[PDB]
C-alpha cells in the first residue's frame, strides 16, 4: 500500500548511502512482524558498503539471536564472499561490519563461521580475512570452544585449519571434551597419504605450544606417532621439542 | 532603492510564491525546488543573529560554507562570511545583491599577474 512506497524510497537511499542519520523506518526493522518481506523491498544486494555496516549495527543490538543469525546468513555473509572474489581485498565498511557482528557471538558463529567452513568452497584468502577478526575481538570461553569442537569434527580443508589455529591462539582455558576432539582431528591424518600444508603443522604447533600441560601420556605418545608418519623438515622437530619438555596436569 | 518596481518593505512582507515570479529564472526554479536543509538552517541562524544585536550596531558575522545559497530579501542587512576554498570573506549583504548567489562574492581563485617565463 503506502508502506511499500516508504521502503521503495529508502531502497534508493541505501543504494546511494555514505553517511549521516538514516531514516527512522530502517532503524525499526527487527521490531517488525513481517521483516523479511520489508527487507526484500529495500534490496540488500543493491546496497552500498557503508550502508551494510549500519545495517549490521542495527541487527546486532536489537536482540533475538535467531533473527540476527538469519540476517548474516542471507545478506551479510554472501556479500563478504562476493567482494573477496571480485576486489581480492575486502572493503573497509564491510570489514567493520564483521567486527560489529561479534556483539552477538552465538549468531556470529552459527551464521558466519560455521556455515562458511561447511560449504567447502571457502578459499584460503576468505579464511584469513575473516579469521583475523577473531584474533581482534575477544570471544566468550563457552562460545569459543563450541565453534572449535565443530571445526575439529568437520571435513578437512586448507581454509579450515586457519580458524582452528587462531582460536587456540587466543589461549583460553579449554573444556576437556574439546581437547579429545582436537587430538582425534589431527590423528585422522596419521594414515593419510595426502601432502599436508604448512598451515596444518602450525596449527599442531600452537596446540602443543600452549596446551602441553593438558595432555595425557596416551594421546601424548599418539602425537609422536603422528609426526613420525607425517614429517616436516622445519616444524616437526619443534613439536617434538615441545612434547619432550612438557609437564602434565 | 527599488527592485523590479518593488520596494524593500514590500519585498520583505511579500509572499514566497510572489517572489517565484519577481526573480530571474534560475532563482525561480530554485525556489520551486525548495530550499535545502542546510540552507534553511543558515537562514534561521541569520534571523537569530540579526535579532540578537544592538540597534545602532551592525550584526555579528555568521560564517558559512554555503556558496550555493541564494540571497533572499530577508538577508538584507546581515554580514556573512563566505568560504572560497581557503579563507572567509566578510560580506555585508546589500539590497542590490538579492538576485545573486553568495558564491559570486568570495572569489575562489587569485587573479593572474604574469611572471617572466623560463626555458620553453
Amino acid at each position: 500500500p503506502r508502506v511499500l512506497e516508504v521502503y521503495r524510497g529508502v531502497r534508493e537511499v541505501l543504494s546511494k548511502y555514505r553517511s549521516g542519520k538514516l531514516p527512522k523506518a530502517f532503524k525499526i526493522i527487527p521490531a517488525l512482524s513481517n521483516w523479511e518481506q520489508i527487507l526484500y523491498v529495500t534490496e540488500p544486494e543493491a546496497w552500498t558498503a557503508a550502508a551494510m555496516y549500519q545495517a549490521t549495527r542495527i541487527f546486532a543490538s536489537n536482540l533475538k539471536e535467531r533473527m540476527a543469525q538469519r540476517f548474516y546468513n542471507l545478506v551479510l555473509l554472501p556479500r563478504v564472499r562476493d567482494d573477496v572474489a571480485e576486489y581480492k581485498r575486502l572493503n573497509f565498511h564491510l570489514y567493520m561490519a564483521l567486527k560489529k557482528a561479534l556483539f552477538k557471538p552465538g549468531a556470529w558463529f552459527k551464521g558466519i563461521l560455521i556455515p562458511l567452513c561447511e560449504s567447502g568452497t571457502c578459499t584460503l584468502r576468505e579464511a584469513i580475512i575473516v579469521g583475523s577478526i577473531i584474533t581482534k575481538c575477544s570471544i566468550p570461553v563457552l562460545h569459543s570452544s563450541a565453534a572449535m569442537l565443530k571445526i575439529a569434527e568437520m571435513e578437512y580443508s586448507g581454509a579450515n585449519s586457519i580458524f582452528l589455529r587462531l582460536l587456540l591462539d587466543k589461549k583460553y582455558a579449554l573444556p576437556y571434551r574439546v581437547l579429545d576432539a582436537l587430538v582425534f582431528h589431527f590423528l585422522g591424518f596419521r594414515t593419510e597419504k595426502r601432502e599436508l600444508p604448512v598451515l596444518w603443522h602450525q596449527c599442531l604447533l600452537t596446540l602443543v605450544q600452549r596446551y602441553k600441560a593438558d595432555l595425557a601420556t596416551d594421546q601424548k605418545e599418539a602425537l609422536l606417532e603422528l609426526l613420525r608418519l607425517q614429517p616436516h623438515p622445519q616444524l616437526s622437530p619443534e613439536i617434538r621439542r615441545e612434547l619432550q619438555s612438557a609437564v602434565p596436569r | 532603492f527599488t527592485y523590479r518596481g518593488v520596494d524593500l518593505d514590500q519585498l520583505l512582507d511579500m509572499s514566497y510564491e510572489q517572489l517565484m515570479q519577481l526573480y530571474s529564472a534560475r532563482q525561480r526554479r530554485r525556489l520551486n525546488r525548495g530550499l535545502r536543509r542546510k540552507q534553511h538552517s543558515l537562514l534561521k541562524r541569520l534571523r537569530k543573529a540579526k535579532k540578537e544585536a544592538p540597534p545602532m550596531e551592525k550584526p555579528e558575522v555568521v560564517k558559512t560554507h554555503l556558496r550555493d545559497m541564494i540571497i533572499l530579501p530577508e538577508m538584507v542587512g546581515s554580514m556573512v562570511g563566505v568560504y572560497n576554498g581557503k579563507t572567509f570573506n566578510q560580506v555585508e549583504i546589500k539590497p542590490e545583491m538579492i538576485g545573486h548567489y553568495l558564491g559570486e562574492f568570495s572569489i575562489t581563485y587569485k587573479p593572474v599577474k604574469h611572471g617572466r617565463p623560463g626555458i620553453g
Partner: peptide, 30 residues
C-alpha cells in the same frame, strides 16, 4: 545448543518519514 540448532507504531514512523521529507525543502516559511 550449537550443533542441535540446525501495527500502531509502524504508522507513526511512516508519518514521521514524510514529515522529515517535507522539512528538507521548505518552499513556504517566513
Amino acid at each position: 545448543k550449537f550443533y542441535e540448532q540446525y501495527s500502531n507504531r509502524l504508522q507513526e514512523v511512516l508519518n514521521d518519514y514524510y514529515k522529515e521529507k517535507a522539512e528538507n525543502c521548505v518552499k513556504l516559511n517566513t
